[PDB]
Design a protein around this ligand. Sequence first.
Ligand SMILES: *[C@@H]1O[C@H](CO)[C@@H](O[C@@H]2O[C@H](CO)[C@@H](O[C@@H]3O[C@H](CO[C@H]4O[C@H](CO)[C@@H](O)[C@H](O)[C@@H]4O)[C@@H](O)[C@H](O)[C@@H]3O)[C@H](O)[C@H]2NC(C)=O)[C@H](O)[C@H]1NC(C)=O
Ligand SMILES: *[C@@H]1O[C@H](CO)[C@@H](O[C@@H]2O[C@H](CO)[C@@H](O)[C@H](O)[C@H]2NC(C)=O)[C@H](O)[C@H]1NC(C)=O
Ligand SMILES: *[C@@H]1O[C@H](CO)[C@@H](O)[C@H](O)[C@H]1NC(C)=O
Ligand SMILES: *[C@@H]1O[C@H](CO)[C@@H](O)[C@H](O)[C@H]1NC(C)=O
Ligand SMILES: *[C@@H]1O[C@H](CO)[C@@H](O)[C@H](O)[C@H]1NC(C)=O
Ligand SMILES: *[C@@H]1O[C@H](CO)[C@@H](O)[C@H](O)[C@H]1NC(C)=O
Ligand SMILES: *[C@@H]1O[C@H](CO)[C@@H](O)[C@H](O)[C@H]1NC(C)=O
Lengths: 171, 169, 169, 318, 319, 318
Amino acid sequence: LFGAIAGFLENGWEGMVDGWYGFRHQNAQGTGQAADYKSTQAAIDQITGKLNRLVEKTNTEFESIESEFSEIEHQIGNVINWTKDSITDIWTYQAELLVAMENQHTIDMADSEMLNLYERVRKQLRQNAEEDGKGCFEIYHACDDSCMESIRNNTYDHSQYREEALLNRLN
Amino acid sequence: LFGAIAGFLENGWEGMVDGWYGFRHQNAQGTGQAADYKSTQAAIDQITGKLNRLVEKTEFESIESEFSEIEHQIGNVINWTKDSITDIWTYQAELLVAMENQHTIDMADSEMLNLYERVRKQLRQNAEEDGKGCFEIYHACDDSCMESIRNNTYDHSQYREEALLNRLN
Amino acid sequence: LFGAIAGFLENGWEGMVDGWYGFRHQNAQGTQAADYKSTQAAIDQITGKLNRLVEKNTEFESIESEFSEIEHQIGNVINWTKDSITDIWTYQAELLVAMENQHTIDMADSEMLNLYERVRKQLRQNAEEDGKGCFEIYHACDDSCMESIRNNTYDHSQYREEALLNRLN
Amino acid sequence: DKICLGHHAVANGTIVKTLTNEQEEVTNATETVESTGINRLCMKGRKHKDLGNCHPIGMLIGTPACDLHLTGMWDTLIERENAIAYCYPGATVNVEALRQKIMESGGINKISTGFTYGSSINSAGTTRACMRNGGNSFYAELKWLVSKSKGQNFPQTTNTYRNTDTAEHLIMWGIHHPSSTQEKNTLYGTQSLSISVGSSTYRNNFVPVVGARPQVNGLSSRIDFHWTLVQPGDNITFSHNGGLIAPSRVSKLIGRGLGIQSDAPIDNNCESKCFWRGGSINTRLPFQNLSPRTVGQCPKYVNRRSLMLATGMRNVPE
Amino acid sequence: DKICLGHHAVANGTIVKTLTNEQEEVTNATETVESTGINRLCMKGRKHKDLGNCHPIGMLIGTPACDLHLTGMWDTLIERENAIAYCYPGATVNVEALRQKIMESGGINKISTGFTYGSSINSAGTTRACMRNGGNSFYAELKWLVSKSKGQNFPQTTNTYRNTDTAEHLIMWGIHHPSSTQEKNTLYGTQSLSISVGSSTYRNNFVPVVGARPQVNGLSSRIDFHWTLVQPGDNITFSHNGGLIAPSRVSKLIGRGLGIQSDAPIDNNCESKCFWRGGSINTRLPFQNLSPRTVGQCPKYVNRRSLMLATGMRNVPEL
Amino acid sequence: DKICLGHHAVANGTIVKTLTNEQEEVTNATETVESTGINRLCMKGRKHKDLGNCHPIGMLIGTPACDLHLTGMWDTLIERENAIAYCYPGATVNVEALRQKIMESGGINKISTGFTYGSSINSAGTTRACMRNGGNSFYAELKWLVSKSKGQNFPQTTNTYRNTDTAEHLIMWGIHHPSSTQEKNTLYGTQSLSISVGSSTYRNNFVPVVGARPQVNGLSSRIDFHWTLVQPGDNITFSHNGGLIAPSRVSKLIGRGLGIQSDAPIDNNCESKCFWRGGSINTRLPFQNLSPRTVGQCPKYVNRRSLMLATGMRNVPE
Ligand SMILES: *[C@@H]1O[C@H](CO)[C@@H](O[C@@H]2O[C@H](CO)[C@@H](O[C@@H]3O[C@H](CO[C@H]4O[C@H](CO)[C@@H](O)[C@H](O)[C@@H]4O)[C@@H](O)[C@H](O)[C@@H]3O)[C@H](O)[C@H]2NC(C)=O)[C@H](O)[C@H]1NC(C)=O
Ligand SMILES: *[C@@H]1O[C@H](CO)[C@@H](O[C@@H]2O[C@H](CO)[C@@H](O)[C@H](O)[C@H]2NC(C)=O)[C@H](O)[C@H]1NC(C)=O
Ligand SMILES: *[C@@H]1O[C@H](CO)[C@@H](O)[C@H](O)[C@H]1NC(C)=O
Ligand SMILES: *[C@@H]1O[C@H](CO)[C@@H](O)[C@H](O)[C@H]1NC(C)=O
Ligand SMILES: *[C@@H]1O[C@H](CO)[C@@H](O)[C@H](O)[C@H]1NC(C)=O
Ligand SMILES: *[C@@H]1O[C@H](CO)[C@@H](O)[C@H](O)[C@H]1NC(C)=O
Ligand SMILES: *[C@@H]1O[C@H](CO)[C@@H](O)[C@H](O)[C@H]1NC(C)=O
């Protein structure tokens, strides 16, 4: 587990219906919300990868060894029952483990994609922002709607605002 | 793996007996130790989830006589089938434990790291990491202050101005 | 997935035939060395998996004649059983590599990130991350200094005042 | 000036199982166990034969119910619950093995034995128990041989069938067991009866035995049916005294096909690869919970109502 | 001033295997393979029958050894090693099929056939091979029919059993195979012998065959036993003229039960759902290494002494 | 002035499957499914018997093709395609069970039955169909008993084999089914024939099935075989009348061995634990796709050509 989803991120945003992960900003001219497309497609792609494997099964042809409509000899009947039930016990167990295993992974994978988005923004903001521990970054310079966007774009150049930001941080 | 347990933390604390995870501190009043209840429960609750899965539970009857002759061809088929079932279960049993153990270990590692991360973000600009799992705090933090760190109620703003000055001089 | 391989590290280095993970240079005099401990940690865990794979077995006898006819009804039971076993082993084998591979990839990612982290904490307040996996160091760091960073012997407090005023000015 | 990172959530979420939690809520999930089946035998793309009330054994010996299924080609053969094998009551040795061979075949050709009988033999026994066109009749592929003169000894007879084909042939015959001494005497004579049959891969002797028995289809007599596979080039010979129910044709099973025992009516407009008693299973899912008895290409049977596979992150509601 | 984070550790760690490391020390771990079973048959909560030296077949035909086991109800039936089926030496066609049917059952009721024989048949023949009270007897459920006049032809005879019940009945009979022509003639006469049996769903016929054989319980002759199921509403008829060992009662198998073959003593104070040749297995664990041949609701058998499941973190002791 | 962290990459990387990605490129990978096997039988360190054109059943009965294989010890026994079991027409009842026993054994001893016959019995008869060197012979372990005086009744006869050993013995015998009533009367007389066979555990009776007149038809002279086990301390008796093909020796299967049906040449230089019809599999890998039919200690058969296990990180070239 990676610590963000069901972690230092308090809860999810029901209002973000545009992606799995995204940004909420607050600046001079209001607040905004926008989904991050790369990170959500990373996660969705990995899910569909699992679903492909789930259906990518392909089949041996089995024939009948049990009469549906007539008595089978008692001893061979018992052997066939023991065998069939033993096979089924194995599959029931394989299905249970598969799903328990795959779900654990899927949850932690999604938590990981969140944490990687968070970490990219952090490194991007460099010395111009500080972590609030609940998922936000407090930015120590005027950050216009087109600034915010540069953060989501990956345009944001920290050295352009570094002087201002360090000034306010140290005071 | 997550880098903390058997990682950037040199070793475990044998003398920490009522927690899996905890805190050691040092201030003017001296030193102390405390376990963190939530992180240890998150680790423990997950183990017992595995144990619950492991003990969940088909009726089978006999298909080979202990005490009388079994026809030779049908007997060889039964021996072949039963051995093939046992190879599958032996493999599954080993794979289960191997996978499960890997995951339990890595899960514990991460609960330690998440505790460590929670405290980092909380100390904000008032402390610095020494790489061994310690946070060097740049202001006086008395026993009451230490507890607010462990409590998750430490307010960094109250000491920030001083901390920044002590970090730069 | 951790942050690093196929993440904030744009690509790998084909010229590094020296190991799996390592450092590259920039100073006056300046330009690559591989890190032994993290490479070994990775390789060791791969060879652990290789040890389990080649782990070997029950003795089986023949239950169908290659060269003569078997009775039709027992023949069908044997056909059904064998294909069932094979369907199970085919499924297990595919699950085994898919799952093992997923873990190998992330494990490797993990070792990259732990090295990176250790260097971060080492450099303390004397460097800043560039987001591409580099640490821009704010003091002069010659070949002996750079070696101390790889060798885990780098002492941050020795450079810290020089570094802080370069960072803040 | 703030910028906040977060994930989505949904108002109502699905519960799934993980390794460490039985009740994990996620944003979404799908089933992995198929629970619904088609209530039809989906035969489109298959040369199928629906046997109706004709039992596979009856195709070989030619019970009236099987008159429409004496020869043919198919890749899927469907047997039904009410299926009739015997009009003249009796039983067949290794019958389940014979049924499975027929149900794995891709068709049946019939070939004359060419047997002919001297004039002291009536080769056209018929009975009320085998009505064919509103008249007394008998198994289409066998001949009931009795004495042409009612109380006289059936003559010592030899009949040989030569498989001059390149594939093995399946030949069936019967041994009559009268229900009284008087019946035996009228059909075959007072002489001791002996019937022996032989090929390169078969040697056996049969003796009709009189015995009182319950009536089945009105008769207290029985026929014991036997069969063997006559290899290419091989000769099978019947040497007999009375009591032999002789083959007039033999069978050749051709190719391979999928045998299905089912309750479900046929749909020739839908396609499927997996069958069971109640019909067809068409699904991409790896597991199913409908029936532990399926034939064809199927999802594996599991003892589980549901198994949800997560397709989203932990749902953390507001 | 500093605050330090850390994790517990213990003096004595235990080793588990992982995907990457087969010598991983962890704080604690728990077993997943059961290695100890109880060496008794734990029968608490079960209405059980211990057959002792009575073989299941002998319940059907009434060997003296099974006199206390001719009828009954049980959910658990226990067969012992070397149990006796036959007093008069012989064998049963498809014996193991029949033994399993009985061992799947939850009881046996006995129903009389009502067979009677005319004034020329002795129905009370006995032998030194089946004893009660230390004297000659015979199977309790069968009757050895011979000629009342030694050396004379056994009369052509018909006996019919009618199943007037709602459940199928299991009828057993014997065919006698004398040890000499002389013996055969005395019992049944010089005539050819034939026995035919016929229901709506069964037809078979048999010939007593003479032949020198080793003595088993003192006898060189044999009885071959045969059985079939008689459906409700159906009649089965025996036509015979010497050689039939005729049923005086038929059997009805009732309900379902668990058959166990073991020679472990019975313990009524412990319960179990899993059994093997020497005992019971009570365990929560999903795997066991006691035996590959088990019966009941059992953990899966594995070819390993031990599989430790970690129940804590890597143990990292101070160095 | 910097320091940069990174990982290695390789020019040409290998593709593998993961839970989430078919086609994931990794720096290196090794195969887990063995697809190549050695085309010889690797017998190094095995004491073994290649039977050649001797069929296992012929070992017990002493067919000419098996003369060099009537006894022996081995931990491995190799059977070949089209091996000869019989020299005289006929077959063995319950043959696969018996072939599997022989093929599970670790050797064979032969023990004389000690059987002796009165002067009215000729037991030296031979036949053109079992040539040995250039002459009429018979199965080595059996004797064809016929009336010394042609046409007279073969005497009522008793023979008893006593197993006085501590392990079970396997006894085989044959039944002659004559080609016609005339051949039968010549060899054994006009009496009705009976062969009964009885131990403490086993009883059975046999009647020769006499055939019918043309020699090329399915009812002619043949000898069919039967067998059972005689336990230590038990005796087995033959009472017979004509038609018995009596054992002059019995067999003791000893120890255990590995049975192999293959047409692959023996190679005494390499070692192996796994075999199939094409010869051998020598791999450390857990799976193989060479054949579903293998004996020994084997990797599991899987329906896949290749399953690559990653042995390095994601490969990320520039
Ligand atoms: C199984 O055995 C059963 C007993 O034999 C068979 O049922 C018997 O079948 C015969 C002939 O089919 C019936 O016989 C006739 O009976 C009437 C008189 O019937 C009334 O009186 C009797 C005697 O008290 C009474 O049992 C009946 O219920 C009637 O009230 C005569 O007029 C005829 O001449 C002739 O004798 C038997 O009645 C019948 N018995 C029973 C109990 O039904 C049965 O057919 C056999 N089953 C099979 C499948 O073969
Ligand atoms: C096998 O046959 C031998 C003789 O045919 C039987 O042995 C004799 O057994 C009796 C009873 O113990 C002894 O009094 C004799 O001394 C034995 N004679 C010899 C020479 O052995 C033996 O009992 C038979 N085995 C079976 C099982 O019937
Ligand atoms: C075999 O098990 C099935 C499942 O309950 C049951 O229908 C059937 O009667 C059993 N058959 C035998 C051999 O008794
Ligand atoms: C079956 O295997 C068991 C256990 O190894 C053995 O004792 C018995 O001989 C074998 N049965 C057959 C048919 O070989
Ligand atoms: C069993 O399957 C094999 C392999 O396809 C085949 O050659 C043989 O006919 C089949 N046996 C039966 C009983 O159909
Ligand atoms: C729910 O899961 C199914 C399975 O992949 C998918 O079709 C669907 O889009 C998911 N729905 C939601 C709520 O996003
Ligand atoms: C079958 O009969 C034909 C015609 O008589 C003959 O050519 C052939 O040899 C016989 N087959 C055998 C195997 O005897």
